[PDB]
Design an enzyme around this catalytic site. Structure first.
Site, short mmCIF file in Angstrom:
data_model
loop_
_atom_site.label_atom_id
_atom_site.label_comp_id
_atom_site.label_asym_id
_atom_site.label_seq_id
_atom_site.Cartn_x
_atom_site.Cartn_y
_atom_site.Cartn_z
N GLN A 18 0.53 -1.38 0.13
CA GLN A 18 -0.02 -0.08 0.12
C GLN A 18 0.62 0.90 0.35
O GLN A 18 0.54 2.23 -0.83
CB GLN A 18 -1.28 0.14 1.43
CG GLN A 18 -1.90 1.17 1.20
CD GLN A 18 -2.84 1.49 2.22
OE1 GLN A 18 -3.30 0.74 3.22
NE2 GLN A 18 -3.82 2.74 1.51
N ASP A 19 1.23 1.62 0.85
CA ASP A 19 2.28 3.25 1.56
C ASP A 19 3.46 2.21 1.73
O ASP A 19 3.85 2.18 2.37
CB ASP A 19 1.35 3.35 2.75
CG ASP A 19 1.51 4.56 2.86
OD1 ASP A 19 0.89 5.70 2.52
OD2 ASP A 19 2.37 5.12 3.90
N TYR A 61 7.06 2.82 3.73
CA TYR A 61 7.33 3.24 5.22
C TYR A 61 8.55 5.10 5.41
O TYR A 61 8.93 5.30 5.14
CB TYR A 61 9.29 2.16 5.79
CG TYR A 61 7.91 0.72 4.99
CD1 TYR A 61 7.61 1.00 6.47
CD2 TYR A 61 8.26 -0.16 4.26
CE1 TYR A 61 6.54 -0.94 6.42
CE2 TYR A 61 7.75 -1.20 4.13
CZ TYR A 61 6.65 -1.59 5.63
OH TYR A 61 6.38 -2.68 5.62
N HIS A 62 7.28 5.61 6.20
CA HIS A 62 7.72 7.05 6.63
C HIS A 62 8.65 7.48 7.21
O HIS A 62 8.79 8.54 8.27
CB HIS A 62 6.80 7.40 6.84
CG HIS A 62 6.04 7.31 7.95
ND1 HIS A 62 6.24 7.41 8.97
CD2 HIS A 62 4.27 6.53 7.92
CE1 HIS A 62 5.20 7.23 10.73
NE2 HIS A 62 4.47 6.29 9.09
N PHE A 99 7.16 -3.80 1.51
CA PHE A 99 7.47 -4.93 3.14
C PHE A 99 9.04 -4.98 2.97
O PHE A 99 9.15 -5.95 3.91
CB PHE A 99 6.19 -6.38 3.04
CG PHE A 99 5.60 -6.07 2.73
CD1 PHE A 99 4.57 -6.26 1.40
CD2 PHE A 99 4.28 -5.95 4.01
CE1 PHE A 99 3.63 -6.04 1.75
CE2 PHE A 99 2.99 -5.94 3.62
CZ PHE A 99 2.19 -6.35 2.71
N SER A 148 4.18 -6.30 9.38
CA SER A 148 3.85 -7.44 8.66
C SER A 148 4.90 -7.82 8.15
O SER A 148 4.46 -9.46 7.82
CB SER A 148 3.67 -6.17 7.04
OG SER A 148 2.02 -5.79 7.61
N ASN A 201 4.39 -1.54 -4.48
CA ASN A 201 3.40 -0.92 -3.28
C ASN A 201 1.58 0.36 -4.25
O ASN A 201 2.97 1.02 -4.86
CB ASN A 201 3.83 0.57 -3.24
CG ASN A 201 4.39 -0.18 -1.77
OD1 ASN A 201 4.88 -0.79 -0.55
ND2 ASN A 201 7.01 -0.34 -1.84
N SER A 228 -7.77 -6.76 1.49
CA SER A 228 -9.20 -6.28 1.87
C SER A 228 -8.79 -4.43 0.69
O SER A 228 -9.56 -5.01 -0.28
CB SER A 228 -9.98 -5.42 2.36
OG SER A 228 -9.24 -5.12 3.08
N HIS A 235 -4.95 -9.44 5.49
CA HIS A 235 -3.51 -8.43 5.27
C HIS A 235 -2.32 -8.79 7.11
O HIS A 235 -2.99 -9.26 7.55
CB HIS A 235 -3.74 -7.23 5.30
CG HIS A 235 -2.30 -6.11 5.53
ND1 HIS A 235 -1.04 -5.98 5.97
CD2 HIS A 235 -2.45 -5.36 4.06
CE1 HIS A 235 -0.45 -5.48 5.96
NE2 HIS A 235 -1.41 -4.55 4.58
N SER A 270 -0.91 -7.48 8.32
CA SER A 270 -0.27 -6.75 9.17
C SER A 270 -1.22 -7.25 10.88
O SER A 270 -2.46 -7.82 10.52
CB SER A 270 -1.07 -5.37 9.17
OG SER A 270 -0.75 -4.69 10.56
N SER A 283 -5.28 -6.44 11.72
CA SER A 283 -6.46 -7.49 11.62
C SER A 283 -7.62 -7.61 11.71
O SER A 283 -8.38 -8.17 11.66
CB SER A 283 -5.47 -8.56 10.52
OG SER A 283 -5.56 -9.56 11.00
N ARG A 338 -8.69 -13.03 11.03
CA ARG A 338 -7.74 -14.37 10.99
C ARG A 338 -7.84 -14.56 9.47
O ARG A 338 -8.80 -14.89 9.03
CB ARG A 338 -7.87 -15.46 11.96
CG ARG A 338 -8.49 -15.41 13.41
CD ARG A 338 -8.18 -16.01 14.26
NE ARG A 338 -8.69 -17.18 14.35
CZ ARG A 338 -7.80 -18.61 14.94
NH1 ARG A 338 -6.58 -18.68 15.88
NH2 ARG A 338 -8.34 -19.64 14.26
#
Lengths: 1133, 74, 331, 221
Positions: free
Chosen positions: D61-62, D64-65, D75, D86, D121, D164, D185, D187, D190, D193
């Site tokens: 998705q995004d 790493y900040h 990942f 994750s 991503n 999702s 996902h 992470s 969640s 499960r």
């Protein structure tokens, strides 16, 4: 690092409570007075009231009550302290040695629980079945009275009732019945319980519970033949007993609340009721013969007898003699006359007793001037309220001050044998003698025929068979009173000269060094009886007859050379009765055997100014209890004199002292004179009941003051005094006052009696407006009692009311200061007030008014409105520091003659107390202990240096130095906080460590610096305090070495001294707040140390056991080593 | 006076290994009082606001951990 | 007695102590009706604070706070500084009770087993003993040598040295099923009040069941050891007679002050109060109700009647935006 | 440092009005906030293997900040940055799915990328500490396009859609031409499960054999 010493300069002077019964013997009618920590015992004589024994207590006497248990000789006394120390004491005297034995003792405090905020109630059953105690709410503690209860163990009965006004044990019942008035939402009522000791519970309960009017305050158990109880509490008096019910609502009692009562007539018939106004009444139970054979109550009578001192408790002592026991003012003796006065007052005043309590305010001055510190107090409340001026020492009122130098003796005579008034004065000189004629108040020179004037006199004065006498360097002369001519002359066998001589009314004793001749007195002849040849020359001799009426002395005192032995001889025997070796090389100078209280003693003076006093044995001739009092530096001359039917001694030295007894203990109260070489008692026509005094130069004749350690001058105000200041420049005192006026029909209020505020020369009223007022009202009233606050200007010497300034309606004056402010050279009288409204719970308004007593008037200088009550003010280096509720304001005085607010401080709940020390400020709060501020000049504001967080309810504060500060808390404690500016962390620095702790037992109102002793150069510091019980005390600073020494000595002393009720001094003085109960530290009980001199000599040696002192250099201690240590400490107050 | 002890208690330990385990112990305990649809929905929220960081882990371990506390107090 | 404090104070030197009658009652009615917040304690280096329990160090230097994450932090009162952090539980610290002496500390959690523990508070922070199934733990009131754990309707008694269960107080018939029931020791230690049933510790026998009028509140012992306070109704411990009904005291977490003179009520059911009451202990007359204006979670006081710690939620009780800080009051 | 194989393909996007806006945003964003991954690192997913040599694709998705963390792969976190939750969760599935697998002791997924696994991503840049920051800005449209090309051009790929969001990006791919493998996902946030026990990695290697392609040495990292 703070170490402090605490000594009572003046004992409590307030009657906490008093009882009559038979204590010392079953015949004697005893009067017992509780003066907080002190117990005063007296015998009620035809003459008045005789002192017996006064004893101190390791506690505040909470309950005092006399009871005669079945199987007892005389009435026993039960004492309970406020620290909960119960005890049963018995009076016991082995002829002269009076001692108070503890028949049983124990601490009755419930491990857990909060004591009733209403206060302790102690009641004994008429039959002596148990001691009833109401100490804690919802619990009735019962101390059973059975033999085996030495540990005074009790139990509690769950008293469902809660908040009991007063409970008394009922008269005329098999079951130990308690009748009480109790408060419950439904109102006040009377209830009855039986106390089952076996089941350890209560049982219903004689008569059914009846309801009583909400102002029911006292329950009087009426003895039989009446029975039941009387329920006092205006506007009604009621009688409850089974089914009988009488109610009397007299119009009289209505005005004031009755506070105490006393049974005049045991059968119940006559009762004395006293109220808050000082009125004295008579409650008269009409004994009704009813019928067969029952004795009923017909009716009740209420008659007014007149006025007395505000009575804390009345005590009738037979023959219309009643003792008005006042806590609020002067205690008094009152006569009740069978017939009415001109005014209609059956009350006749008899005697009045000093009562500094409550000491509201204090200050130390120098009114007479030069080194003499004098205290002035705001003492008493309401009509009883006055001003007291406490001076240290006994001063002499001169009436004659002739110019004679080098006078070697003074003697009084009766030239005419018909008169009782003295008319002559004889003056001895080095090689001459002179006679003074006292024709009225005028004194001229004479010569009395038969007297040798070309020789020095050793004794002179009128003797037996209508004759006079003279003892010279050469011979002893006898002169006839009618006509004046020599009748006999005593010669020394080998023409030798008399060295030292003594005489009385019938005996003469002369000495020629080792030669000692004894002569007698017969009509027209000097009959010589005997002569003894000593070891060495004689320094002094005395033959004063003591007891009973005979006129002759059975023994002779003697002082000898080199050996330094104070020997006794028998008359005319010359038998070496008792020899006291004093040792050293210092020679004795003057000896005198004398009687004080009723007991006999001997006195001895030395060439170094050191006295020795012993116990002169009645018929025996022994010297018991060798004591030492170091007085002057110069040798002392001793003389007897009569002052208000009391034979006291006057010790002539560079340090003049008056010797007398109080509580069978020898007192050495000083004289307010420079140096007296020779004294004489003179009762002339013009100079009656006065005394002649001479020195190196100038002979003076005058009257002595009332012989007491401190002298108290009373100035009645007839209203409540509040704060005092002294404007040295204005040569006057500024006093705050409060008088009560009642809201009448016509207008607002009408005053009750004339007070100092009304009886002023110059009168004033506050014309100020400020407060609108109404908004905010002010209900008013309608038969309500209102306070009237006034500032008073009192003259430095006449003490008359020069001026009275009346403050606003509903205004209270709280704090005044006299000082010079800012750049202003005028000395101002600054007052802090508050707008008190009975309806509201805290004042939200008040004012600081500035005044100046210029000329003969009181002018309103400046005024500043505050949003609270001005609790305190200080002279803070040109500025005025003030306490307004939750704030500490520093007011700067301007050119504009006005108060400007410089900086504030708020971290206090109710800041009620203020003290300064240059830049430092000490703040004492309502509940949050103390706090230290310091004005940072460059910053222009306060900086909190350290706080004390402890929940100590303050009574008064005081700065000891820049790093140590002392406080007084409402649970009667003293504490000292230290400032550790040095500590590793800020957290520690910003913290005031309670380093000093001490349970004082007194409620301190005033803390002020200085001393009463004449300062000209052991201890370093002086703080005086004043309490509610009228006690005056002193706190001073000690070094580590000395504290460590005096502390070891305290712990040593504690072992030796016997307690009254077997109470531990360590406990008594142990710090005690609701919460903490911690051992008292960093404080030294001066009062306990000063008792070291009083106690026994073997008991003194018992102290020094292995006493080693570093004054890193070990010097060993003896009893004499320490007597001198303590001697310094006694002279400090 | 004064001084605090020495933390010789629980220690973390090898964190992330621990953190991850505590989250899934808590995740189940939460599920026995709250509808597993609301609890997931709170997880994303946390995920959008925090991201796949550990900081975000502890902040659901806090949110969850707090709800249960209030629940307990009711 | 006078109402106006300045007049009361003028009579205080007359006339001592407390001037006229009812003290004192007026003085406490003035003092304990007033509270100034003086400082806040925010959780360490977290953007959102998560305290759930407040408690002072025994000597009261540090104020100890429980985190939601099961930690325990002692914050130095004067400094503010977090002096130290200890990992206690795996769930929200609900309770903290420092051993009067400061050798020990009791802890209770939310759901993590063990729910209660005893910890070494001296030199080394150890776990001494665990009480696993007990959700609330309290020390014996006497000289704290026992621990009084509860498990719903059931009581438990433990030895602090051994860590062993001694008594299990419960009668299902006499039980009241008080929701927020808490088994407490008497001021003398010999009695226990649990689920509205008063018991005798030594005999392990029930004494009385205080008739059900409330639904959540179990009650406390007054420190007089004379009365018992089941919600409103004030009963006598020996008589069982009802004494008074204090309607103001309904649903209150009540806690007496050190001297046992003022009661602190905490109204509960967002659940818990935004305000708290005080009353005069001597006569159950209310003093004041203080609106902290923030949802309180816990409340404590020191011995010195100086500070009032309170866990206040800074910002609405939304799952997310929950910031339980600790505020400090003066009196 | 965009990868030439992909550069000669995706290039058409750059000109698009969405992409111009996205680059200009990212531009002005780095002029004001610290944006991760830094320039060269933004496109490591491309410079690791040739677009043709890609067998497996994993959607993220995004970025790493955190500083020196974000590097181009989903990942994946640089050394010595510890693995994100994750990843720690994904690694834990590899141990319960692949025989000779050990924890690689770091978070760098360079290994899989060189080997033929795409770690793309949805969003390619983010403000420091600001979680989704550069959200609905453009990036998604570009990666949606990267995805579209692999569906339309390459054949026999294994799509690993976790959770999702990633599942919704893959809705457009046919399970009949490619192999779409979907679960929850990784992470631990969640509540649902799913990912735990799915055996997605072994399944990848089984399906590689049916296609006849070289297997993925999951252990090589």
């Amino acid at each position: 690092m703070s170490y402090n010493y605490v000594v009572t300069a003046q004992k409590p002077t307030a009657v906490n409570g008093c009882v009559t019964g038979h204590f010392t013997s079953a015949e004697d009618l005893n009067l017992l007075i509780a003066k907080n920590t002190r117990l005063e015992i007296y015998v009620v004589t035809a003459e008045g009231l005789r002192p017996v024994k006064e004893v101190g207590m390791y506690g505040k006497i909470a309950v005092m009550e006399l009871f005669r248990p079945k199987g007892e000789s005389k009435d026993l006394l039960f004492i309970l302290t406020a620290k909960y120390n119960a005890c049963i004491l018995e009076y016991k005297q082995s002829g002269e040695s009076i001692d108070i034995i503890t028949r049983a003792h124990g601490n009755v405090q419930d491990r857990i629980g909060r004591p009733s905020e209403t206060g302790i109630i102690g009641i004994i059953d008429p039959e002596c079945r148990m001691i009833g105690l109401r100490l804690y709410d919802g619990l009735f503690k019962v101390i059973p009275l059975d033999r085996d209860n030495k540990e005074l163990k009790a139990f509690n009965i769950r008293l469902e009732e809660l908040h009991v006004i007063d409970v008394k044990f009922l008269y005329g019942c098999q079951a130990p019945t308690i009748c009480f008035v109790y408060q419950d939402p439904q109102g006040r009522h009377v209830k009855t319980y039986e106390v089952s000791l076996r089941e350890k519970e209560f049982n219903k309960g004689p008569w059914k519970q009846e309801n009583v009017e909400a102002e029911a305050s006292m329950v009087i158990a009426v003895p039989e033949p009446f029975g039941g109880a009387i329920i006092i509490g205006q506007e009604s008096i009621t009688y409850h007993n089974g089914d009988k019910y009488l109610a009397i609502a007299p119009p009289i009692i209505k005005q004031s609340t009755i506070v105490c009562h006393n049974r005049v007539d045991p059968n119940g018939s006559r009762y004395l009721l006293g109220d808050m106004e000082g009125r004295l009444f008579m409650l008269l139970l009409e004994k009704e013969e009813q019928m067969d054979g029952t004795v009923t109550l017909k009716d009740l009578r209420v008659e007014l007898l007149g006025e007395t001192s505000i009575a804390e408790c009345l005590t009738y002592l037979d023959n219309g003699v009643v003792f008005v026991g006042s806590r609020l003012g002067d205690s008094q003796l009152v006569k009740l006359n069978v017939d009415s006065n001109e005014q209609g007052s059956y009350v006749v005043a008899m005697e009045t007793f000093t009562n500094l309590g409550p000491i509201v305010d204090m200050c130390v001055v120098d009114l007479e001037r030069q080194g003499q510190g004098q205290l002035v107090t705001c003492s008493g409340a309401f009509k009883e309220g006055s001003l007291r001026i406490i001076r240290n020492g006994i001063g002499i009122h001169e009436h004659a001050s002739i110019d004679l130098p080098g006078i070697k003796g003074l003697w009084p005579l009766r030239s005419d044998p018909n008169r009782e008034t003295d008319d002559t004065l004889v003056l001895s000189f080095v090689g001459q003698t002179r006679v003074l004629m006292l024709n009225g108040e005028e004194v001229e020179e004479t010569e009395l025929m038969g007297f040798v004037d070309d020789q020095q006199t050793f004794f002179c004065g009128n003797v037996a068979h209508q004759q006079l006498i003279q003892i010279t360097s050469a011979s002893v002369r006898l002169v006839s009173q009618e006509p004046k001519a020599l009748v006999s002359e005593w010669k020394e066998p080998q023409a030798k000269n008399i060295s030292v001589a003594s005489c009385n009314s019938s005996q003469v004793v002369v000495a020629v060094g080792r030669a000692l001749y004894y002569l007698q007195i017969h009509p027209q002849e000097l009959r010589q009886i005997s002569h003894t040849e000593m070891e060495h020359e004689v320094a002094c001799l005395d033959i004063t007859p003591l007891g009973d009426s005979n006129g002759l002395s059975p023994l002779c005192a003697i002082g000898l050379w080199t050996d330094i032995s104070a020997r006794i001889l028998k008359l005319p025997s010359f038998e070496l009765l008792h020899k006291e070796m004093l040792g050293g090389e210092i020679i004795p100078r003057s000896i005198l055997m004398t009687t004080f209280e009723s007991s006999h003693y001997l006195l001895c003076a030395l060439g170094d100014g050191a006295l020795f006093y012993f116990g002169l044995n009645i018929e025996t001739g022994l010297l018991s209890d060798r004591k030492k009092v170091t007085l002057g530096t110069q040798p002392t001359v001793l003389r007897t004199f009569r002052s208000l039917s009391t034979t006291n001694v006057f010790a002539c030295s560079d340090r003049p002292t008056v010797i007398y007894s109080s509580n069978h203990k020898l007192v050495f109260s000083n004289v307010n004179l420079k140096e007296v070489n020779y004294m004489c008692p003179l009762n002339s026509d013009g100079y009656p009941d006065s005394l002649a005094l001479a020195n190196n130069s100038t002979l003076t004749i005058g009257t002595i003051d009332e012989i007491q350690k401190l002298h108290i001058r009373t100035v009645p105000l007839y209203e409540s005094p509040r704060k005092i200041c002294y404007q040295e420049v204005s040569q006057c005192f500024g006093v705050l006052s409060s008088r009560i006026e009642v809201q009448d029909t016509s207008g607002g209020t009408t005053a009750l009696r004339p007070s100092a505020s009304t009886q002023a020369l110059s009168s004033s009223v506050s014309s100020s407006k400020l407060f609108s007022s109404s908004t905010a009202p002010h209900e008013t009233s309608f038969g309500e009692e209102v306070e009237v606050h006034n500032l008073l200007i009192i003259d430095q010497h006449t003490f008359e009311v020069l001026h009275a300034h009346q403050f606003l309606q509903n205004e209270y004056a709280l704090s005044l200061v006299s000082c010079k402010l800012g750049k202003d050279p005028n000395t101002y009288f600054i007052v802090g007030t508050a707008m008190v409204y009975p309806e509201e719970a805290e004042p939200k308004q008040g004012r600081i008014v500035v005044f100046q007593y210029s000329d003969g008037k009181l002018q309103t200088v400046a005024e500043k409105e505050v949003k609270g009550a001005v609790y305190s003010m200080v002279e803070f280096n040109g500025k005025l520091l003030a306490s307004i509720n939750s704030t500490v304001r520093l007011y700067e005085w301007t050119t504009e003659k006005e108060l400007r607010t410089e900086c504030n401080h708020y971290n206090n709940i109710m800041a009620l107390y203020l003290k300064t020390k240059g830049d430092f400020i000490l703040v004492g709060d309502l509940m949050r202990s103390v706090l230290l501020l310091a004005y940072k000049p460059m910053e222009g504001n306060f900086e909190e240096i350290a706080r004390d967080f402890n929940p100590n309810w303050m009574s008064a504060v005081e700065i000891l130095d820049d790093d140590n500060f002392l406080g007084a808390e409402n649970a009667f404690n003293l504490f000292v906080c230290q400032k550790d500016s040095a500590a590793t962390t800020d957290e520690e620095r910003q913290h005031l460590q309670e380093v000093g702790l001490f349970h004082l037992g007194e409620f301190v109102n005033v803390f002020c610096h200085g001393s009463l002793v004449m300062q000209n150069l052991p201890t370093q510091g002086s703080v005086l305090f004043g309490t509610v019980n009228g006690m005056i005390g002193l706190v001073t600073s000690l070094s580590e070495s000395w504290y460590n020494l005096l502390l070891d000595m305290q712990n040593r002393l504690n072992k030796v001294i016997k307690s009254v009720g077997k109470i531990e001094h360590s406990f008594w003085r142990s710090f005690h707040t609701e919460r903490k109960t911690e051992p008292a530290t960093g404080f030294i009980d001066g009062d306990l140390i000063e008792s070291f001199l009083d106690i026994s000599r073997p008991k003194m040696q018992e102290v020094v056991a292995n006493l080693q002192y570093d004054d890193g250099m070990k010097r060993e201690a003896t009893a004499d080593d320490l007597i001198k240590v303590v001697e310094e400490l006694t002279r400090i107050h | 006076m004064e001084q605090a002890p020495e933390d010789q208690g629980p220690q973390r330990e090898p964190y992330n290994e621990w953190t991850l385990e505590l989250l899934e112990e808590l995740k189940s305990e939460a599920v026995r009082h709250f509808p597993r649809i609301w609890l997931h929905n709170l997880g994303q929220h946390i995920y959008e606001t925090y991201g796949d960081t550990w900081a975000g882990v502890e902040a659901i371990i806090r949110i969850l951990q707090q709800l249960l506390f209030i629940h307990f107090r009711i | 007695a006078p109402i106006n404090f300045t007049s009361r104070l003028n009579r205080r030197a007359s006339f001592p102590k407390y001037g006229g009658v009812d003290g004192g009652c007026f003085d406490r009615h003035l003092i304990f009706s007033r509270f100034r917040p003086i400082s806040v304690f925010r959780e360490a280096n977290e953007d959102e604070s998560g305290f759930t329990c407040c408690a002072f160090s025994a000597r009261e230097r540090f104020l100890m706070l429980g985190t939601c994450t099961g930690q325990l932090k002692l914050y130095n009162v004067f400094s503010g500084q977090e002096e130290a952090s200890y990992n206690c539980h795996n769930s929200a610290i609900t309770h903290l009770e420092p051993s009067r002496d400061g050798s020990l500390l009791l802890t209770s959690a939310t759901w993590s087993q063990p729910l209660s523990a005893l910890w070494g508070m001296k030199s080394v922070f150890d776990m001494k003993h665990s009480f696993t199934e007990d959700h609330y733990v309290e020390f014996s009131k006497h000289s704290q040598d026992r621990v009084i754990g509860t498990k719903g309707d059931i009581a438990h008694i433990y030895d602090i040295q051994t860590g062993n269960k001694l008594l299990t107080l419960f009668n299902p018939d006499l039980a009241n099923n008080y929701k927020r029931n808490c088994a407490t020791f008497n001021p003398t230690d010999d009695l226990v009040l649990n689920d509205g049933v008063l018991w005798d510790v030594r005999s392990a026998q029930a004494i009385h069941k205080f008739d059900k009028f409330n639904m959540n509140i179990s009650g406390v012992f007054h420190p007089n050891g004379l009365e018992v306070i089941i919600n409103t109704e004030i009963w006598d411990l020996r008589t069982f007679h009802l004494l008074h009904t204090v309607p103001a005291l309904d649903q209150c977490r009540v806690v007496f002050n050190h001297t046992g003179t003022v009661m602190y009520g905490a109204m509960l059911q967002s659940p818990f109060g935004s305000s708290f009451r005080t009353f005069n202990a001597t006569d159950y007359k209310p003093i004041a109700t203080i609106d902290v204006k923030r949802n309180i979670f816990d409340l404590c006081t020191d011995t010195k009647d100086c500070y009032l710690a309170v866990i206040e939620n800074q910002g609405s009780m939304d799952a997310l935006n929950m910031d339980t800080v600790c505020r400090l009051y003066e009196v | 440092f965009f990868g030439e194989s992909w550069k000669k393909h995706l290039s058409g996007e750059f000109g698009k009005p969405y992409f111009i806006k996205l680059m200009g945003f990212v531009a002005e964003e780095r002029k004001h906030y610290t944006v991760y991954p830094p320039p060269h690192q933004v496109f490591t997913w491309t410079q690791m293997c040739d677009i043709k040599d890609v067998k497996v694709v994993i959607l993220g998705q995004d970025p790493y900040h955190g500083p020196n963390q974000a590097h181009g792969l989903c990942f994946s976190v640089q050394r010595p940055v510890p693995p994100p939750p994750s990843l720690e969760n994904i690694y834990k599935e590899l141990s319960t799915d692949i025989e000779d697998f050990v924890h690689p002791g770091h978070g760098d997924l360079s290994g899989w990328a060189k080997q033929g696994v795409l770690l793309l991503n949805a969003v390619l840049t983010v403000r420091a500490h600001q979680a989704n920051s550069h959200k609905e800005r453009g990036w998604e449209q570009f990666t949606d396009a990267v995805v579209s090309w692999l569906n339309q051009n390459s054949n026999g790929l294994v799509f690993l859609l976790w959770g999702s969001y990633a599942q919704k990006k893959g809705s457009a791919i046919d399970r009949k031409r490619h192999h779409v493998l979907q679960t929850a996902h990784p992470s631990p946030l969640s509540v649902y499960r799913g990912f735990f026990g799915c055996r997605h990695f072994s399944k990848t290697n089984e399906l590689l054999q049916k296609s006849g392609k070289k297997p993925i040495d999951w252990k090589e990292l």
